[PDB]
RNA sequence: AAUUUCUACUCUUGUAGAUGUGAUAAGUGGAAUG
DNA sequence: ACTCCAGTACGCATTCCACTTATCACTAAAAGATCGGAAG
DNA sequence: CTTCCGATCTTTTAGTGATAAGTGGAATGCGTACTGGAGT
């Protein structure tokens, strides 16, 4: 039995903090006059160009070492393919261990210990190999093992400039470490040779092999496409795709050249180019090599390579008057060039040529007229008549046909009059003018004022317009055209064509968020500042903390001239005031620091290589410690598993001896931490006894949280206050939101975690651990036009009197112009509408907008472990959630979907499958989201077009679901219930979603999955479980999308498609594609595979019958439980909901259509009266109650079945909406075995409200349905995804 | 319209949620308009 | 013989911008370089 | 005057267990044009 409470402390997470630094006395004016900040910067900024430099020689010794590889590959060959053909674990395991093999195999030639090369040359690999990640890359032995790598002056002084500063590159270098590794990662060189690019290498040449087998003759076109291309001319085609070749390709010149071999570069077509050619053919030849794999795979760049086609550039205009500048030169450009005086000289030419040589392109002539007429259907209408006058409706619709691909000046003008020429020319002058007016016109100093934009606007946008009027006249061979004229036209057109980017990064620029976020490293001439926080480590790394009546302090502690000389404060009694510095003893991991301090020191390596008699180590110990040849020997064996490790048990299988090798290191190091003078004083009682252990894993997992302490002792004020007077220490102030002085209510979460790290319950036990490696920063103060609201002027809420709805921003601006009495415009009429219902303020203290950006500020970024006192790695978390669920059968279920009506919808149901609640999340913590993004999505071309600055839908749509997350775990805590999403890597939404872009909905997902895995309350006590030291685990850790599964703990993945369209109270389903009822005899086949309708007296509705058995064409292929189905056409009668408002049955709302295309408007039906008035036509007695079906059918009016199957499909479909008038539901077709047909405009609260609660619904149900499926199975195990065909099979089952 | 940072705000010199940072490498993809 | 029309058919186009996916560190002390100052 | 030594500041170094045992993987809808049969 366990409960729910207990999914507590299952695992250690990693987190971290981020303040801003307060400097408090003369701290700021030390470090200004010591001058750090400048010399960080100017550090940053050598480390900055100096990576690629120091990176080059990591690659000249990855491409020097790469090329003598000659290692064959047919035994991973035959370990894929055979991985392939069977599929077991067993050949999993064997390719994992080739792969493995393979890896460490190319990886000798890393470190130099293949058999394979001379041992000379072995042993110089090694020694660089041991050189590449030690200090000596600025200046040493390395350069000179390598001696093709050749390095200037000026990069070997900056090399130089990291004298005694070689541990900025520590963690860079330990980054290089996983670059050169084989442990099976993904950013390993062996990993990149072995399991990614020689799989896609083997498929290649097995579609080869395939290709060349079946269709023959075509080794020839292969080899003149490789000898047009020109590479690899030492070898034969079939030898470039044989297994050996695969010793080359390794460098990633090699890799460049077969993907341009693969694809080609003049235009030299390459391998995939010379096939689809093939395929094009549609002969025999073509139609053989269609069914075969045709499409050979380039491989993947290697690591740490330059690359080459450098993908995409985006480039980024970086600074304004740096874009100015670029502004000057292209105007400078067009001034030199002259193109005023060749726009005129083709003006002039263009009343003095043959207009009837010179056409226009086809897709902009309306703008034309839009341009020169009143409405842009003039011109066609008037060619469209005069086209008629020259001559039915196939010869108007060739007419057209043939006069807009050739739109001539001449027939334009005869067709219209002169009216066009002389608006032509009108135009032409005018904006000949401005352009010249825009060039004369000066550029702005700078860019950071508003009318600066528009002057630069206006500039663009008369440049613009010349090039709109520019590109009208058609240049294409298509037509003739006047040689000279089209000559000078493309000379004027793309002497000034790139105009066009400098439009767009211009637009960037505008519309790019104000701020600068670049911040750089702080060192304060310190390698490994505050890297630790250990007392003994206080010297050189030099960063304390200090609490001083609620309020936290970061002190770091200067090194002196010259030499440093440390403060050592001493401690004083609690009674006296000042501040509590805190004392932090931390012993890392045992793992690594146990054989750290013993049996891996020089001394004893150096000792044992000739002695066996054990050796005494006495310095940093209380008493000394025996080391004998018997645990020597464990640490350090000549295989690779050692002893008391668990490798070795699973290899060899002695349990007895892996026991005694595992007891006598558990004795060694307890007596280790018994002796050991930084350990000898922690108390070890808690440990359990040495022979009592399964494994030393968790030895150490047990042992670690035990060595680790914080203390705090008091230290008087006046010696910090001269220390921080002298500029011995200095002090900061951590600083956030919350520890301001006007600060009123809730606390953020990184308060909440801080707080209670220092909580005297979380000092007495840790469960939560102040790790080291912390980082300072300082961000300069970014260039900003300020804006603040001043004293004494009025200032404007953004909502009404109601609180949920905002206001359009571009009324805002208007409102807020109006209410400061800027005016200078009309009021307008919807601003004076809402007048009354809006709230202003008379300001009492200056607010400066976005104040954290106009001064440049110092943070400080601090990493912190949650639930440390539980293991560093979940243990079958999945099982251990599976075995709740099994105990506990009365969890309810919380399906979330998205949707049309609501941006995200919640039910909460019970295992019986009744309802519980159901909410719409359109309003969170009373305001609106729904009518914030309509207003943006309104908006956004206006501001798009205004070169106006706003915040994208992105941000918006990624900040509600923030919101979102806090009232899905609220709920999820108040119900102790499991929680279904949606499977996005198996369904696929509709484009009226309001959340409907995959990116930015997988990353609620993401945000949802590492939320619950450290899932803390604001409200909560810190001792009961959810509070600060007790965080709720419901959620494993995330790894990857598809490799999470669909049980990720309490929280259920299930697939999207059939959840909004199907019957709550039936599951009936759309059982037709309508693709196929095209054509008039695949009506009558749809017809004729219908069972039977007629009309019914009692009730007044049509009955219709149809069977799955029959009409399996037009019907998809998803059988139902149901064998049969009683579609009902109900009579249409004014019904009452609960709450009594009248509504029509049966209405349907369909899309309305001109003759083939739909125009996005929306017709309601009442298909009832339709049918009897189809009926009507015929005169057939619907009211004996016969079979009518085959009397409709019996004749052909292919215009009455044309209206038959289109009203079917009405019916039978089952949601309508209707965004004009709010109208969203789900009506049914079909009848429950009480007899009623479902219908949610009734608003009965036991069954959904809407589309939306009825999707949400039947996700709920289908994780239902998995949860059923787990507490019948026995294995603790989900069915890895739920088929469409199954979970229709059980609605249809449990409902009927 | 103020924030370690983001989103939305104003009874409140601030509010309600969210908030793993830094470094490196790789895949290349997403959005808009027709 | 001419014209309508309705079922049929084949195949996206350009422009613009950065988004996501894996790896590691979250460290005190041993070891080594360097240096101001002392011994021959 | 020349050579060595303990303090001091950087650097690099030790390394435990274990997990997926699957990857149900998606299917373009829209649109402008085409052509063969039927009415006049």
Same mark, same amino acid.
């Given at each position: ?11 250690? *997470? ?57 290692? !064959? ?67 040493? /032995? ?38 050169? %590794? ?69 460098? #990633?010149? &090699? ?34 090599? $269609? ?31 740096? =874009? ?123 860019? @950071? ?28 061979? %298509? ?198 003078? @930084? ?12 022979? #009592? ?109 109601? #609180? ?36 202003? /303020? ?60 609501? +941006? ?13 609640? &159901? ?23 206006? $501001?798009?077009?205004?070169? %106006? ?29 499991? *929680? ?19 990116? =930015? ?10 939320? +619950?895995?450290?899932? =803390? ?38 697939? $999207? ?39 019914? *007296? ?40 609960? @709450? ?32 009897? $008035? ?64 479902? !219908? ?30 787990? @507490? ?25």
């Amino acid at each position: 039995m366990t409960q729910f409470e207990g999914f507590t402390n299952l695992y250690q *997470v990693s987190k971290t903090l981020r303040f801003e630094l307060i400097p408090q006395g003369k701290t700021l004016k030390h470090i200004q006059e010591q001058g750090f900040i400048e010399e960080d910067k100017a550090r940053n900024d050598h480390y900055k160009e100096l990576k690629p430099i120091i990176d080059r020689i990591y690659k000249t010794y990855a491409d020097q070492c790469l090329q003598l590889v000659q290692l !064959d590959w047919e035994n991973l060959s035959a370990a894929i393919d055979s991985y392939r053909k069977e599929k077991t674990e067993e050949t999993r395991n064997a390719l994992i261990e080739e792969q493995a093999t393979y890896r460490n195999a190319i990886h000798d030639y890393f470190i130099g210990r293949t058999d394979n090369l001379t041992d000379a040359i072995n042993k110089r690999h090694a020694e660089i190999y041991k050189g590449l990640f030690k200090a000596e890359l600025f200046n040493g /032995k390395v350069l000179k093992q390598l001696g093709t790598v050749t390095t200037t002056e000026h990069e070997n002084a900056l090399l130089r400039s990291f004298d005694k500063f070689t541990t900025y590159f520590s963690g860079f270098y330990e980054n290089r470490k996983n670059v050169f %590794s084989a442990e099976d990662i993904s950013t390993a060189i062996p990993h990149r040779i072995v399991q990614d690019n020689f799989p896609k290498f083997k498929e290649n040449c097995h579609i080869f092999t395939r290709l060349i087998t079946a269709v023959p003759s075509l080794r020839e076109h292969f080899e003149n496409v490789k000898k047009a291309i020109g590479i690899f001319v030492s070898t034969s085609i079939e030898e470039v795709f044989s297994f050996p070749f695969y010793n080359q390709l390794l460098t #990633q010149t &090699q890799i460049d050249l077969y993907n341009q071999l693969l694809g080609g570069i003049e235009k030299i077509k390459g391998l995939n180019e010379v096939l689809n050619l093939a395929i094009q053919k549609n002969d025999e030849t073509a139609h053989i090599i $269609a069914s075969l794999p045709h499409r050979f795979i380039p491989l993947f760049k290697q690591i740490l390579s330059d690359r080459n086609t450098l993908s995409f550039i985006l480039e980024e205009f970086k600074s304004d008057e740096e =874009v100015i500048q670029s502004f000057c030169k292209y105007k400078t450009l067009l001034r030199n060039e002259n193109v005023l005086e060749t726009a005129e000289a083709l003006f002039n030419e263009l009343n003095s040529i043959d207009l009837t040589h010179i056409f226009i392109s086809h897709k902009k002539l309306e703008t034309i007229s839009s341009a020169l007429c009143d409405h842009w259907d003039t011109l066609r209408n008037a060619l469209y008549e005069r086209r008629i006058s020259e001559l039915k409706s196939a010869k108007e619709k060739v007419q057209r046909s043939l006069k807009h691909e050739d739109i001539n000046l001449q027939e334009i003008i005869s067709a219209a009059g002169k009216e066009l020429s002389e608006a032509f020319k009108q135009k032409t002058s005018e904006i000949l003018s401005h352009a010249h007016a825009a060039l004369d016109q000066p550029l702005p100093t700078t860019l @950071k004022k508003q009318e600066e934009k528009e002057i630069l606007k206006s500039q663009l946008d008369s440049l613009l317009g010349l090039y709109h009027l520019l590109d009208w006249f058609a240049v294409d061979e %298509s037509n003739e055209v006047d040689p000279e004229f089209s000559a000078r036209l493309t000379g004027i057109k793309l002497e000034m064509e790139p105009s066009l980017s400098f439009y767009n990064k211009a637009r960037n620029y505008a519309t790019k968020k104000p701020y600068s976020v670049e911040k750089f490293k702080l060192n304060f001439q310190m390698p490994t500042l505050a890297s630790g926080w250990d007392v003994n480590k206080e010297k050189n790394n030099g960063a304390i903390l200090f609490v001083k009546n609620g309020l936290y302090y970061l002190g770091i502690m200067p090194k002196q001239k010259g030499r440093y000389k440390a403060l050592s404060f001493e401690p004083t009694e609690k009674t006296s005031e000042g501040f509590d510095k805190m004392y932090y003893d931390y012993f890392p991991d045992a793992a690594k620091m146990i054989p750290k301090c013993s049996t891996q020191l020089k001394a004893v390596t150096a000792h044992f290589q000739t002695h066996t008699t054990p050796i005494l180590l006495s310095n940093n110990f209380i008493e000394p410690l025996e080391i004998t040849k018997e645990i020597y020997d464990l640490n350090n064996p000549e295989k690779e598993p050692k002893k008391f490790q668990t490798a070795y048990a699973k290899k060899t299988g002695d349990q007895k001896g892996y026991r005694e090798a595992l007891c006598k290191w558990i004795d060694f190091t307890r007596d280790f931490l018994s002796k050991y003078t @930084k350990t000898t004083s922690i108390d070890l009682s808690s440990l359990r006894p040495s022979s #009592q252990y399964k494994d030393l894993g968790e030895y150490y997992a047990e042992l670690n949280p035990l060595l680790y302490h914080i203390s705090f002792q008091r230290i008087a004020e006046k010696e910090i206050m001269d220390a921080v007077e002298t500029g011995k220490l200095y002090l900061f102030q951590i600083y956030n939101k919350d520890f301001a002085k006007g600060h009123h209510g809730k606390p953020n979460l990184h308060t909440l975690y801080w707080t209670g790290l220092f909580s005297p319950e979380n000092l007495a036990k840790t469960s939560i651990k102040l790790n080291g490696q912390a980082e300072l920063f300082y961000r300069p103060k970014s260039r900003m036009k300020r804006m603040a609201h001043r004293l004494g002027e009025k200032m404007l809420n953004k909502k009404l009197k109601d #609180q949920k709805t905002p206001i359009p921003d571009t009324l805002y601006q208007e409102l807020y112009d109006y209410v400061n009495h800027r005016l200078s415009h009309d009021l307008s009429d919807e601003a004076r509408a809402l007048l009354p219902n809006v709230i202003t /303020k008379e300001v009492s203290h200056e607010i400066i907008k976005d104040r954290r950006f106009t001064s440049d500020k110092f943070f400080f970024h601090v990493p912190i472990t949650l639930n440390y006192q539980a293991a560093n790695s979940p243990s079958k978390f999945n099982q251990r959630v599976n075995a709740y669920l099994k105990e506990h059968p009365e969890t309810p279920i919380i399906g979330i979907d998205r949707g049309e009506r609501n +941006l995200i919808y919640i039910t909460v149901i019970d295992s019986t499958g009744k309802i519980l609640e &159901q909410r719409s999340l359109n309003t969170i913590q009373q305001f609106d989201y729904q009518k914030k993004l309509d207003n943006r999505e309104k908006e956004r071309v206006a $501001a798009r077009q205004a070169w %106006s600055v706003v915040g994208t839908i992105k941000d918006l749509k990624q900040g509600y679901l923030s919101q979102v997350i806090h009232e899905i775990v609220d709920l999820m805590i108040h119900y102790q219930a499991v *929680v279904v999403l949606e499977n996005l890597n198996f369904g696929f939404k509709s484009k009226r979603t309001g959340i409907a872009e995959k990116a =930015v909905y997988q990353q609620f997902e993401k945000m949802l999955i590492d939320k +619950l895995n450290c899932l =803390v309350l604001k409200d909560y006590p810190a001792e009961k479980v959810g509070g600060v030291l007790n965080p709720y685990q419901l959620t494993d850790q995330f790894t990857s999308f598809a490799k999470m599964g669909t049980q990720s703990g309490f929280l259920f993945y299930v697939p $999207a498609p059939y959840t909004s369209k199907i019957d709550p109270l039936t599951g009936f389903v759309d059982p037709f594609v309508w693709k196929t009822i095209k054509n008039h005899e695949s009506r009558k086949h749809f017809l004729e595979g219908f069972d039977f309708l007629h009309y019914d *007296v009692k009730t007044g509705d049509f009955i219709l019958h149809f069977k799955m058995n029959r009409n399996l064409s037009f019907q998809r292929g998803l059988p139902g439980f149901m064998p049969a189905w009683d579609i009902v056409f109900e009579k249409n009668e004014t019904q009452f909901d609960a @709450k009594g408002t009248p509504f029509i049955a049966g209405k349907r709302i369909v899309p309305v259509i001109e003759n083939h295309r739909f125009t996005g408007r929306y017709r309601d039906l009442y298909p009832a009266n339709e049918l009897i $008035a189809l009926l009507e036509e015929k005169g057939i007695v619907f009211r004996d109650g016969s079979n009518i079906l085959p009397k409709l059918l019996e004749n052909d009016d292919s215009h009455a079945i044309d209206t038959m199957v289109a009203l079917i499909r009405s019916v039978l479909q089952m949601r309508n909406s209707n965004a004009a008038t709010g109208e969203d539901y789900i009506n049914s077709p079909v009848r429950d075995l009480n007899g009623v047909c479902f !219908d949610s405009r009734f608003q009965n609260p036991e069954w959904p409200m809407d589309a939306d609660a009825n999707g949400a619904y039947h996700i709920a149900l289908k994780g239902q349905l998995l949860l059923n499926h787990l @507490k019948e199975s026995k294995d603790l195990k989900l069915q890895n995804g739920i088929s469409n065909q199954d979970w229709l099979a059980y609605i249809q089952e449990l409902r009927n």
